């Protein structure tokens, strides 16, 4: 899960998830 190149802190104003019925990359 941990990776030094990635900051594990979500923006409170953005839901950090995706709808499985929709391709996340549009």
């Amino acid at each position: 899960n941990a990776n030094p190149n990635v900051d594990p802190n979500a923006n409170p104003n953005v839901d950090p998830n995706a709808n499985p019925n929709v391709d996340p990359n549009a």
Partner: antibody
Framework: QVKLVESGGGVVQPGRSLRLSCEASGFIFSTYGMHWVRQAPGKGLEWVAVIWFDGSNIYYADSVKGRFTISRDNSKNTVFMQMDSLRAEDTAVYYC?????????????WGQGTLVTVS | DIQMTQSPSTLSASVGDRVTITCRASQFISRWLAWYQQKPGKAPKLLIYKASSLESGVPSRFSGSGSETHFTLTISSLQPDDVATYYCQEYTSYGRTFGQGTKVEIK
């Protein structure tokens, strides 16, 4: 606007040293870390070394261990690479790279690279 | 000491075709595989953030998949503008490991 600007190349006769640098611009190097990526002409990319901010994490590729040293000028926001006892195999373009990922998307930042010839 | 390998070192396909580039690692990448596109003479650009995650600004034609030690980059509707050497990057720690690079040309 974020840029990484490399300088300090040239022709180094075998056995001589070279000191390369990458000037940070548009950001303060106070977060993740800086990488040197080497590419001999006609060859693929080779990561050479990383200096993590404040020097807590220093790593090198096996091919340069004991020959290359990296450090930062903490006043000029500039990353330096000390290359000692250079050999012919070290001919390459040395690129400054600053990759990290942080919530909103990826960041990479590549410079243009400094050409170092060792013949 | 993690080796990165791109088996299809050279590929070629006509314009509009589909190019499949595989990538393997001797140790787990665990989806932290970045894909880069290097046009000769230029610094490489990041295409794929991580396994199956395309970077914004990178054409939707690019896609990929993988996990563990086995990954693939797919180039749909291949264009002349895609002739580049593509590279695998492992970013699981404080430093990066690169693959050999695969050259994709046009038939």
């Amino acid at each position: 606007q974020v840029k990484l600007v490399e300088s300090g190349g040239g022709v180094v006769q075998p056995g001589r040293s070279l000191r390369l640098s990458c000037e940070a611009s548009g950001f303060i190097f106070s977060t993740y870390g800086m990488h040197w990526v080497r590419q001999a002409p006609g060859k693929g990319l080779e990561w050479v070394a990383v200096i993590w901010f404040d020097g807590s994490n220093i790593y090198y590729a096996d091919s340069v261990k004991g020959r290359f040293t990296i450090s930062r000028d903490n006043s000029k926001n500039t990353v330096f690479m000390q290359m000692d006892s250079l050999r012919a195999e070290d001919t390459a373009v040395y690129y400054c790279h600053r990759n990290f990922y942080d919530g909103s998307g990826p960041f990479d930042y590549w410079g243009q690279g400094t050409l170092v010839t060792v013949s | 000491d993690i080796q990165m390998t791109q088996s299809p070192s050279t590929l070629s396909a006509s314009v509009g075709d589909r190019v499949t580039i595989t990538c393997r690692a001797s140790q787990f990448i665990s989806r932290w595989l970045a894909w880069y596109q290097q046009k000769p003479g230029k610094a490489p650009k990041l295409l794929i953030y991580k396994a199956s995650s395309l970077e914004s600004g990178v054409p939707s034609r690019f896609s990929g998949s993988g996990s563990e030690t086995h990954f693939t980059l797919t180039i749909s509707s291949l264009q002349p503008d895609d002739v580049a050497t593509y590279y695998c990057q492992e970013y699981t720690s404080y430093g990066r490991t690169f693959g050999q690079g695969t050259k994709v040309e046009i038939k």
